[PDB]
Design a protein around this nucleic acid. Structure first.
Length: 86
DNA sequence: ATATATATATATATATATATATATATATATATATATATATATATATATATATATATATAT
C-alpha cells in the first residue's frame, strides 16, 4: 500500500518512546536524525497526543503530553502515561 | 591261693613353637543434616486510574 517511513526515523522514535528521551552525548545518531527530521517526528507523535520538547543547550530531547491545557479536567489524565507520585 | 609290691605300659597333661582366626583401637572415605546465600513470591501499603451507576442539562 503506502510507502515506508525511513528506518532511522522509526528506530529513533521507538527509542525515544522506550526511554522517554534522547541524549546527544549518548546516542548522537538518533538525536541528530530526529532533530533533522523534526516535522516528521512531531507528525508521527501528534495522533497519540505526544510531542517532543527539545533542548540544544543541554543536548536533551524528551516527550511531552500535547494535550491542550485543561481540556476536559482541571488536571489532565492521559491513557498511555501513568502519573506516578514518588 | 590271695595279698603286698614290682618294672614297665597306657595314656595323657603339659609345654613349646607355629599358624590362623578373631577382637580391639585407630585412621580414613563417603553419606548425611544443616548453615549460608540469591532469586522469587506474598502480602502489605500508597496512589492512580478504570469502571458502573447517577445527577443534571439537553434533543426531538
Amino acid at each position: 500500500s503506502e510507502t515506508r517511513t525511513l528506518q532511522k526515523i522509526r528506530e529513533a522514535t521507538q527509542e525515544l518512546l522506550k526511554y522517554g528521551l534522547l541524549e546527544e552525548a549518548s546516542k548522537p545518531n538518533l538525536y541528530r536524525i530526529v532533530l533533522s527530521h523534526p516535522e516528521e517526528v512531531t507528525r508521527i507523535l501528534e495522533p497519540l497526543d505526544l510531542d517532543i520538547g527539545i533542548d540544544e543547550i543541554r543536548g536533551l530531547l524528551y516527550v511531552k503530553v500535547r494535550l491542550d491545557e485543561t481540556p476536559a479536567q482541571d488536571e489532565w489524565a492521559h491513557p498511555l502515561v501513568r502519573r506516578q507520585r514518588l
